[PDB]
Amino acid sequence: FFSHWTSKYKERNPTEIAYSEDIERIIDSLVTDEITKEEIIHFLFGNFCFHIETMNDQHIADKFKGYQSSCINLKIEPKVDLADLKDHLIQKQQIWESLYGKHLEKIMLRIREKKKKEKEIPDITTAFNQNAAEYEEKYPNCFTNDLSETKTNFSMTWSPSFEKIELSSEVDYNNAIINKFRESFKSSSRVIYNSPYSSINNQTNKARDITNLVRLCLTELSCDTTKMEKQELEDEIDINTGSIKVERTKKSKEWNKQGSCLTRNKNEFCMKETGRENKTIYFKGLAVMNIHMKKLIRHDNEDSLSWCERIKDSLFVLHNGDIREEGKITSVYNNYAKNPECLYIQDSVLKTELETCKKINKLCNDLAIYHYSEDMMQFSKGLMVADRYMTKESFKILTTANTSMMLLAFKGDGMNTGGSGVPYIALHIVDEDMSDQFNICYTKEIYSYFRNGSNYIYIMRPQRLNQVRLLSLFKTPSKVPVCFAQFSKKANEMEKWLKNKDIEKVNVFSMTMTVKQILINIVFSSVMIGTVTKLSRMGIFDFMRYAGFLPLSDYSNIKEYIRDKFDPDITNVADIYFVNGIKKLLFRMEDLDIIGGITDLNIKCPITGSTLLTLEDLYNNVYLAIYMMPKSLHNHVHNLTSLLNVPAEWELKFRKELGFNIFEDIYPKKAMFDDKDLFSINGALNVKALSDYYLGNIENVGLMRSEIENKEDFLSPCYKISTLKSSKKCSQSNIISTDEIIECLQNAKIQDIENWKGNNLAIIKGLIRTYNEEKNRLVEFFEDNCVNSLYLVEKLKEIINSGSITVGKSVTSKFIRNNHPLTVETYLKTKLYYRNNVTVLKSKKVSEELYDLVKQFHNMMEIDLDSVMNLGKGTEGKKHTFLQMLEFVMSKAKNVTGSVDFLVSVFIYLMSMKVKMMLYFIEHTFKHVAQSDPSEAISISGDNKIRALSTLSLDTITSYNDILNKNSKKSRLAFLSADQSKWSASDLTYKYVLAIILNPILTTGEASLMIECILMYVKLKKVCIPTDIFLNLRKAQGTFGQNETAIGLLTKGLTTNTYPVSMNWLQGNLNYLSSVYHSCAMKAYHKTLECYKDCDFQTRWIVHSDDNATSLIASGEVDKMLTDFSSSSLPEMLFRSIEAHFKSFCITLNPKKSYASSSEVEFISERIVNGAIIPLYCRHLANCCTESSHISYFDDLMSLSIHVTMLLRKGCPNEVIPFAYGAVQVQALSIYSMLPGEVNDSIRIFKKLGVSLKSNEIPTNMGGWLTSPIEPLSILGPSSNDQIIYYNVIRDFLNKKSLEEVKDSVSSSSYLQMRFRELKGKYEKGTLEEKDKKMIFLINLFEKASVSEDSDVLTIGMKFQTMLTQIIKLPNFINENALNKMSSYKDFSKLYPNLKKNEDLYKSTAKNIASSLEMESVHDIMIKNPETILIAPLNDRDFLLSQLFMYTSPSKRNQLSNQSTAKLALDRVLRSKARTFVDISSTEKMTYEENMEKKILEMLKFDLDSYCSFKTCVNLVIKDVNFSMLIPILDSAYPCESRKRDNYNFRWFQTEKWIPVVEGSPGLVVMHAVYGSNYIENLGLKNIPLTDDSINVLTSTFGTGLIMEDVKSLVKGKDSFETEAFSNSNECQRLVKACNYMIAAQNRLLAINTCFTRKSFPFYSKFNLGRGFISNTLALL
Ligand SMILES: NC(=O)c1ncn([C@@H]2O[C@H](COP(=O)(O)OP(=O)(O)OP(=O)(O)O)[C@@H](O)[C@H]2O)n1
Ligand SMILES: NC(=O)c1ncn([C@@H]2O[C@H](COP(=O)(O)OP(=O)(O)OP(=O)(O)O)[C@@H](O)[C@H]2O)n1
């Protein structure tokens, strides 16, 4: 172990760091009445003398010099010798050790003072009544007993039953329904208005208006079109971004002319030229939709439960008469659920489970679950399509696969600025038989009805829906059938009735009344849960995650949670059913193998099905009801204001508590270190606790320092660090300069009104738009910022008085949204000098910021080629380290920079590059400290062992309780599952300095650097609100009474943007240091509890930042000490004592999610009771239906199959797995890669062109369907589907039986050439069988759509986790708009000027006069330095021009252009049906399906010279270690009943193929297990040679393309070119594979040693660092 001091800061002490008086205040504030200042200093600087056994002697001299300097600067006489300090610190030990007993007495007094003040509620009903009483006390008379003023019961949209077959013959089936309703709505006027909820005083007077509006819109304002063209969209260039989807200017944006009406497309109509009485009727109907006063019903309303107990069974009657049999959602769900035998390889033993799944599918078919979900999905489609394009004088009649359903959509909030939603009136035709049940069910929203024929025509009430609510309505086919399947499985009456009957006898007719009632509840709950669009239902359902703990003890959650902080916001009826289910569960728990519920007689909360055989069924039902709700139905505008509003309040609370005023700095005070309640710690106890923690954790200072400076990439340049190189995002305050602003104002003349070209017109527009209403501040900015005062304003006078200028109005958000960003910059900056300063932080990549930092380190600001190339080559040139750049940044910004670097923004938080580097240093010097702690969970690599540590924390605790309580005394268990509240907001930050001073694995210079870093992070941090949000609050504050909650007080009345956030580190920034402090606090808790005299306590705790998993086992005289601690049992003891102890460590325990029990613990989401773990597969099942990224079909299908895989891991039953398959299929296919029957299908396209591939053999990237079985998807993952179909077509191609025959036939090198020649001859003369055409198709697909194709991992870093990739990559930007606003492009465009800057066509013309010379120079200084463009930067001049030589490849600007951005819905369902661009430069615009047709027609021919990709695709499949041993196990596995499996329910999968396959690869003994598998299954050991040699072939071709063209067999000389010409013999890839298969050189790298050999043939082996890298078979563990 060698020691290296990594600082120029060596001669700096922690008491001379500019912000050094705060350390003096911390020292002065730690002085107690028993410990003086001298002992505090001697302990704090000198604690390292307990660690002096593993550190160097130069480290000894360094730390003793730091000790002496600290004592001299603090006016204390230091000890002369190190042994003198050791003797003094070992003799003043009992003074410091006595703090634990006083702390024990303090927490006992705090429990005694806290339990006396609280009040006790007698029962749960009194808690509910007290909540209702205080709710009436806030707002009086808010509770109404009349059910006529409430909100809508049955949510956004209503689905009647569809009773008549509608024949179509030349009548356009979508349009025949509209004229059917029109001819129904032409009879007389027997309009009966509906009184809601059987009321008597019906006002009406609006039902007449709605009826007249609907009659007008269906009689006069619309007609049978049947001839107009469909809506077609086209991509267009935006003035701020690229490639947005919009309607074309002609055709589908123009109003056509039918007979006396105006029409746009097949659905939209208009009334621009209509009679005045008709216009009056239209406006009278429009005024209804608007184009305390809360009536909340009580929890104990017996009328609402009685009404719901008729509404929810009228719904079941309505869900029982539908006659439709085929559809889109029905087809995809019946692909998996109607025949689930294909998913399971050994399906012959699942004769009961698969039959139950088939019965659940038949019940879904007969109750019209699929058809209702499909109707909701397409109506949400049509509704948001209507939301963006509708005007006030137009409507958008929607029709679907329905028979008796329409919707009359009206003007919504196009160009979304929050808004309210899109109005819509739905019409229904119901027959005479189901007429009373329709009135009973939808009694609130039926607005008028009349009778025509044997039918009733219903007009329902208009509502409105935001885009988020339409998106939650969209995922109905993914959310409702899985709800029906899970609730039908977990209900024991439903499953019990399903098990006796047969598939031909399952119907509603042969049902008992109890099973029918359970089915009614299941249908109603699935409908109400799968589509949720109300905030009250979300409040009710996330109230449910705390009122659901049965096996419990004292938690302060049964009664004190249902008091004041519970919000009973029940607005409608029939959520009384859900709240009443909660109330019955709580009343049951009040009156009091896991068998938890066969004896308690528990009741399901949403589905009410009794006789619960297992507690895990209850946990699964509640948590699936919880996790299926959306994250938020609020807009991003409201959510961002909430996220920017919480820290302002939690900082104003801190300032008010500790006496700081609003506009001043933050310094330590005595109150923070005096053991107070709100914002304080104990002080001297914290120092002793941290010293004891560092004594007990760090065992070798030098070895751990070596691991820190070797594994965290210290003493290495910053581009080797993945956090500071991989472009996440960043924040750099780029503001147009004020001198540049006044210069642009000066050069903007008044004689060039026509010639206002360039970007200066944007500055002119911004200053004029600011002048139009903000005259008060523009004169101040024009007279104080610039030295010329009157000239600028007098020039602006005739600038506005020039007559012609393009400004409409200060429309605020309408100006911001669709104008150039520098217009926003100027419209800000001309009124921001002394107030409202903003200083807008625009986002940037960290790679560009690191590029600028490396450029600024070597003083190469102005870019010059000789200046960068003079830095040397190889591993002997100029190179920096991470800490040298860190101190360069610190020395730069300590020089009066204005503290612009400490500015974060919300985009979860967006910090600067400096703050990212300081947080990296502080984070990763404590990551290894937390890695040495066995009780620390955030240091666990991944989520794999997170469950494992909880398993140990249960197992050793239970084993020790079994080993102690049987001998001498009694023991009581106490498991704590705490979660702290405001872990970052309420936390004192200055206590982290004490964790750094006492750190022994450090240096007195590095410690000073970290202390100064944390002190500037506290004293100078600020938060900048974004421009649109701050303008919204500014205009709201101007219109209103000018008061705000906390943001107005912090920003001096909203007159400035940056508000101070000092003692609140942002969440995720200190995630290891806070966890270290938490574990230190728990060790101090154990040391404090060890001070009790006649009792023995041992504590086991587990810490992951915010969370806690404390266990405690007491022994001895328990009965006396329990009333000493003021409690009744050990969980009550633990919940009181830990809460009292944590207040001395600035940790706030909240009595909401923190419970204490004697048998149950929870950690994050996993949960283990009495040595057995409850599975909780709810999160993955909900992620299978709700969470998606919305980027592509391939990406989202591969991402959702992760959740399917973890569903298979965590014990899912075998009847929800086919529904999980169907759910991920609907969620992947329902946006862009369209559903069966639509335009972007892949079964239909492959069937039309006669492709030889079958339905279940289409690859995933071809738009095909996930058809991998249960076992290979569970073991390998989503990347196994294409591997399985490739292996199947290969095994059919060479006509073999097993994989081993294929392996020993491929292993001969003279075999695949003969097969390829035989295939070529077969294609030649006369014969091509089906297998040959399949093999040819997949060979050409591997050529055209391999994952390595058109990708390099050094421009954008990818991971290569699959075999193939997306074959259409839509460009997010067109031309060089993606490459702009970049320092790399601005440098590349300067030393290589506009001959090669603008544009891609100018560079492409240099491949067939000055651009050819520039390209020749580029590739001449590129090909002489080969290591700079296709490996990682070895040093500088391998990084600064590595970012410069990537803007020359056509496939490296395309890769940066089509980067996957976030976007949202309606930007991808519209782009899929639009004529999109192909690449970065093409005049041709073509659709997605036509592109797919062209690509499939391209990959149909044999295309000889395809031998290399044939051998590559064979060898990528067969050579996998995991696949080649998983397949023979699956092929030769015994069914059951010998050692594999003998149980039935949820015990085939976890007994037959996840334990005899885990005795397969690593060998194992355990029988039943929930699996956290190994790392990712590697299919990228062979693909990173493909990328790293494809880029070599590309630069070879682009180097050889200038001087000459040639074909082959080149004779030129100049060895680096002749050897690459010999390298390009066939493709260079078969040469790569064969040549480095038959030898293995493996020469080391020094870039002169390796360039000594040859530039081409053995050099490429040192551009991947490995060859034929075969991994080991992964242990599932
Ligand atoms: N992005 C939008 O279009 C939108 N959505 C809701 N809002 C807020 O609510 C009002 C109604 O929106 P509009 O801009 O369509 O109404 P308008 O201003 O009276 O009509 P117009 O566009 O023809 O001038 C608007 O005045 C505005 O305050 N704006
Ligand atoms: N009630 C609690 O016991 C609790 N648990 C966490 N927190 C801290 O609260 C900050 C923001 O709260 P959020 O609105 O994001 O939800 P949350 O974290 O789940 O807390 P809560 O249950 O109170 O809503 C978050 O920064 C979070 O750390 N409070």
mmCIF file with all atom_site columns, N, CA and C in Angstrom, residues 495-511:
data_model
loop_
_atom_site.group_PDB
_atom_site.id
_atom_site.type_symbol
_atom_site.label_atom_id
_atom_site.label_alt_id
_atom_site.label_comp_id
_atom_site.label_asym_id
_atom_site.label_entity_id
_atom_site.label_seq_id
_atom_site.pdbx_PDB_ins_code
_atom_site.Cartn_x
_atom_site.Cartn_y
_atom_site.Cartn_z
_atom_site.occupancy
_atom_site.B_iso_or_equiv
_atom_site.pdbx_formal_charge
_atom_site.auth_seq_id
_atom_site.auth_comp_id
_atom_site.auth_asym_id
_atom_site.auth_atom_id
_atom_site.pdbx_PDB_model_num
ATOM 1  N N  . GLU A 1 495 ? -63.263 -18.473 -7.274  1.00 0.00 ? 495 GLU A N  1
ATOM 2  C CA . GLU A 1 495 ? -62.369 -19.555 -7.677  1.00 0.00 ? 495 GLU A CA 1
ATOM 3  C C  . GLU A 1 495 ? -62.949 -20.918 -7.325  1.00 0.00 ? 495 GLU A C  1
ATOM 4  N N  . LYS A 1 496 ? -63.598 -21.020 -6.162  1.00 0.00 ? 496 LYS A N  1
ATOM 5  C CA . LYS A 1 496 ? -64.213 -22.274 -5.745  1.00 0.00 ? 496 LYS A CA 1
ATOM 6  C C  . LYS A 1 496 ? -65.355 -22.667 -6.671  1.00 0.00 ? 496 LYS A C  1
ATOM 7  N N  . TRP A 1 497 ? -66.171 -21.700 -7.095  1.00 0.00 ? 497 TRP A N  1
ATOM 8  C CA . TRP A 1 497 ? -67.222 -22.007 -8.057  1.00 0.00 ? 497 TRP A CA 1
ATOM 9  C C  . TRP A 1 497 ? -66.652 -22.329 -9.434  1.00 0.00 ? 497 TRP A C  1
ATOM 10 N N  . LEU A 1 498 ? -65.550 -21.679 -9.823  1.00 0.00 ? 498 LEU A N  1
ATOM 11 C CA . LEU A 1 498 ? -64.944 -21.957 -11.122 1.00 0.00 ? 498 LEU A CA 1
ATOM 12 C C  . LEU A 1 498 ? -64.304 -23.340 -11.172 1.00 0.00 ? 498 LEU A C  1
ATOM 13 N N  . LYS A 1 499 ? -63.850 -23.865 -10.030 1.00 0.00 ? 499 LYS A N  1
ATOM 14 C CA . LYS A 1 499 ? -63.129 -25.134 -10.051 1.00 0.00 ? 499 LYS A CA 1
ATOM 15 C C  . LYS A 1 499 ? -64.028 -26.346 -10.296 1.00 0.00 ? 499 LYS A C  1
ATOM 16 N N  . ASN A 1 500 ? -65.295 -26.317 -9.876  1.00 0.00 ? 500 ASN A N  1
ATOM 17 C CA . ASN A 1 500 ? -66.160 -27.467 -10.139 1.00 0.00 ? 500 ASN A CA 1
ATOM 18 C C  . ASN A 1 500 ? -66.703 -27.501 -11.562 1.00 0.00 ? 500 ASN A C  1
ATOM 19 N N  . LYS A 1 501 ? -67.094 -26.355 -12.115 1.00 0.00 ? 501 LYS A N  1
ATOM 20 C CA . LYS A 1 501 ? -67.784 -26.325 -13.393 1.00 0.00 ? 501 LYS A CA 1
ATOM 21 C C  . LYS A 1 501 ? -66.812 -26.577 -14.543 1.00 0.00 ? 501 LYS A C  1
ATOM 22 N N  . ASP A 1 502 ? -67.366 -26.792 -15.730 1.00 0.00 ? 502 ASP A N  1
ATOM 23 C CA . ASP A 1 502 ? -66.596 -26.978 -16.950 1.00 0.00 ? 502 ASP A CA 1
ATOM 24 C C  . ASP A 1 502 ? -66.636 -25.700 -17.777 1.00 0.00 ? 502 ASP A C  1
ATOM 25 N N  . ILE A 1 503 ? -65.822 -25.674 -18.836 1.00 0.00 ? 503 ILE A N  1
ATOM 26 C CA . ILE A 1 503 ? -65.726 -24.482 -19.673 1.00 0.00 ? 503 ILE A CA 1
ATOM 27 C C  . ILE A 1 503 ? -67.002 -24.250 -20.482 1.00 0.00 ? 503 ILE A C  1
ATOM 28 N N  . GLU A 1 504 ? -67.797 -25.287 -20.732 1.00 0.00 ? 504 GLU A N  1
ATOM 29 C CA . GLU A 1 504 ? -69.050 -25.107 -21.452 1.00 0.00 ? 504 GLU A CA 1
ATOM 30 C C  . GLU A 1 504 ? -70.210 -24.728 -20.542 1.00 0.00 ? 504 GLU A C  1
ATOM 31 N N  . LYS A 1 505 ? -70.020 -24.766 -19.223 1.00 0.00 ? 505 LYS A N  1
ATOM 32 C CA . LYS A 1 505 ? -71.096 -24.501 -18.275 1.00 0.00 ? 505 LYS A CA 1
ATOM 33 C C  . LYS A 1 505 ? -70.819 -23.307 -17.371 1.00 0.00 ? 505 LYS A C  1
ATOM 34 N N  . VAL A 1 506 ? -69.844 -22.467 -17.701 1.00 0.00 ? 506 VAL A N  1
ATOM 35 C CA . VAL A 1 506 ? -69.589 -21.250 -16.940 1.00 0.00 ? 506 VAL A CA 1
ATOM 36 C C  . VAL A 1 506 ? -70.453 -20.149 -17.545 1.00 0.00 ? 506 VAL A C  1
ATOM 37 N N  . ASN A 1 507 ? -71.427 -19.677 -16.771 1.00 0.00 ? 507 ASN A N  1
ATOM 38 C CA . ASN A 1 507 ? -72.300 -18.587 -17.184 1.00 0.00 ? 507 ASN A CA 1
ATOM 39 C C  . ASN A 1 507 ? -72.915 -17.970 -15.938 1.00 0.00 ? 507 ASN A C  1
ATOM 40 N N  . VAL A 1 508 ? -73.601 -16.845 -16.142 1.00 0.00 ? 508 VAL A N  1
ATOM 41 C CA . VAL A 1 508 ? -74.261 -16.156 -15.039 1.00 0.00 ? 508 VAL A CA 1
ATOM 42 C C  . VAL A 1 508 ? -75.511 -16.921 -14.601 1.00 0.00 ? 508 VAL A C  1
ATOM 43 N N  . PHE A 1 509 ? -76.066 -17.752 -15.490 1.00 0.00 ? 509 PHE A N  1
ATOM 44 C CA . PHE A 1 509 ? -77.321 -18.451 -15.218 1.00 0.00 ? 509 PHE A CA 1
ATOM 45 C C  . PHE A 1 509 ? -77.143 -19.490 -14.111 1.00 0.00 ? 509 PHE A C  1
ATOM 46 N N  . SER A 1 510 ? -76.111 -20.324 -14.208 1.00 0.00 ? 510 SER A N  1
ATOM 47 C CA . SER A 1 510 ? -75.921 -21.420 -13.255 1.00 0.00 ? 510 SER A CA 1
ATOM 48 C C  . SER A 1 510 ? -75.034 -20.981 -12.088 1.00 0.00 ? 510 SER A C  1
ATOM 49 N N  . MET A 1 511 ? -75.433 -19.881 -11.454 1.00 0.00 ? 511 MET A N  1
ATOM 50 C CA . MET A 1 511 ? -74.665 -19.275 -10.377 1.00 0.00 ? 511 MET A CA 1
ATOM 51 C C  . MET A 1 511 ? -75.531 -19.132 -9.136  1.00 0.00 ? 511 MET A C  1
#
